[PDB]
Amino acid sequence: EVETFAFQAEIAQLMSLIINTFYSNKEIFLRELISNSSDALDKIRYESLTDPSKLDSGKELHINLIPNKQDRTLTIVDTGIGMTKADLINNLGTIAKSGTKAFMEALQAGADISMIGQFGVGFYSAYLVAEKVTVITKHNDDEQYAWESSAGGSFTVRTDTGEPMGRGTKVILHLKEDQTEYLEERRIKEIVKKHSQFIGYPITLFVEKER
Numbered sequence: 187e188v189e190t191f192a193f194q195a196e197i198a199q200l201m202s203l204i205i206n207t208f209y210s211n212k213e214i215f216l217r218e219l220i221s222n223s224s225d226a227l228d229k230i231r232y233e234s235l236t237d238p239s240k241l242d243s244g245k246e247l248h249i250n251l252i253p254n255k256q257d258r259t260l261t262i263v264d265t266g267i268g269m270t271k272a273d274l275i276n277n278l279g280t281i282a283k284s285g286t287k288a289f290m291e292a293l294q295a296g297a298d299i300s301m302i303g304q305f306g307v308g309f310y311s312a313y314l315v316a317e318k319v320t321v322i323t324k325h326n327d328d329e330q331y332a333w334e335s336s337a338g339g340s341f342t343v344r345t346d347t348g349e350p351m352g353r354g355t356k357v358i359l360h361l362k363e364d365q366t367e368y369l370e371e372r373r374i375k376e377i378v379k380k381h382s383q384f385i386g387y388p389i390t391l392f393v394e395k396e397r
């Protein structure tokens with residue numbers, strides 16, 4: 187049981203600009219995904235202060251970066267608050283619509299793609315490097331879901347039958363064939379050091395064993 191939704195035309199127009207751009211500083215996608223994870227971890231931590239039971243689904247607060255050269259995927263995993271079905275299909279899109287509208291005008295104006303996160307559409311910077319993004323998430327108040335889009339005008343949402351995650355989010359970047367540098371340990375280390383090492387949670391870059 188998979189539900190397929192259309193994006194509104196202006197969002198669809200932004201995702202196409204992003205997926206098609208030759209903008210050179212594409213490393214900024216990683217800062218944006220890590221920032222979302224950090225926000226998600228803050229959110230559940232600030233919630234846990236009054237209601238301690240909000241961490242029964244996992245005490246550990248961390249971010250893991252998981253390259254897989256075999257599958258050409260970079261996965262960003264966190265144990266933050268996660269997202270509900272209603273977040274994925276409704277609440278997040280309200281912010282995306284408002285953020286999109288504005289950013290598309292600043293782009294006309296001659297603003298830089300790296301300020302995408304200022305307008306709350308930083309998530310879409312994934313398409314700088316990915317042909318498809320799969321978001322698998324578990325919020326305390328809902329079941330485990332997978333959102334996915336290839337920036338083709340639509341996204342799907344389905345119950346995720348896969349491995350239970352407890353609480354948190356995995357963003358799986360199915361990388362563009364010309365963007366495989368983002369699977370190299372040397373490259374990921376460089377970006378995290380430049381853009382993300384002052385994040386307030388441990389970021390663990392996983393190494394791969396022999397194929």
Ligand SMILES: NC(=O)c1ccc(-c2nccc3c(-n4cnc(-c5ccccc5)c4)cccc23)cc1N[C@H]1CC[C@H](O)CC1
Pocket residue numbers: 193194197222223225226229264266267268269273274275276278279280282283309321333355357
């Ligand atoms: N790692 C993460 O938790 C995360 C990972 C990804 C995203 C994320 N941000 C923006 C848009 C998303 C999205 N989406 C993109 N467009 C739509 C959309 C657009 C129009 C209509 C309907 C949906 C949904 C799908 C999945 C994750 C998204 C957000 C995330 N975190 C937010 C911070 C914590 C709370 O504030 C809520 C979650």
